[PDB]
Amino acid sequence: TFVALYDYESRTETDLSFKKGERLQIVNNSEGDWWLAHSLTTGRTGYIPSNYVAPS
Amino acid sequence: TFVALYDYESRTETDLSFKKGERLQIVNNSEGDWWLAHSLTTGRTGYIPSNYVAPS
Incomplete structure (x- = not known):
């Protein structure tokens, strides 16, 4: 749970x-x-999407 | 520098x-x-955009 600064x-x-001021929850996804x-x-x-790549 | 898996x-x-197989570089941005x-x-x-929020 997070709060929006802007x-x-x-x-x-x-x-x-x-x-x-809004309150947000991060959604886990693939x-x-x-x-x-x-x-x-x-x-x-x-x-x-960062899970699609890997360091070289 | 990263490599695409998919x-x-x-x-x-x-x-x-x-x-x-493509090679990618991450762009730093605000x-x-x-x-x-x-x-x-x-x-x-x-x-x-994650820099717009903070943990509650």
């Missing part, structure tokens, strides 16, 4: 909007945390 | 598609890791 407005269909990543292989960039 | 197809405008969260205050659910 308002946040959603940018896509999958993010959660919330106001400062994808793991999401990270912003750059593909050295393709040059594209964007968020990935 | 293919991943993007679901939104902000996630990165990639194939097994939002921090993103987590799937449920709002006990509003009942809505979806991804949030």
Whole structure:
């Protein structure tokens, strides 16, 4: 259980909007945390599910 | 630097598609890791930027 420090407005269909002060619980899911990543292989960039990758 | 273990197809405008074997670098950004969260205050659910919250 966490508390929001700041308002946040959603940018896509999958993010959660919330106001400062809201109480949130983290949902365990298979994808793991999401990270912003750059593909050295393709040059594209964007968020990935961290359980899909491993250190080289 | 990481290596993709699985293919991943993007679901939104902000996630990165990639194939097994690709090499990825994590981008440091202010939002921090993103987590799937449920709002006990509003009942809505979806991804949030973890630097926007703190443990209660």
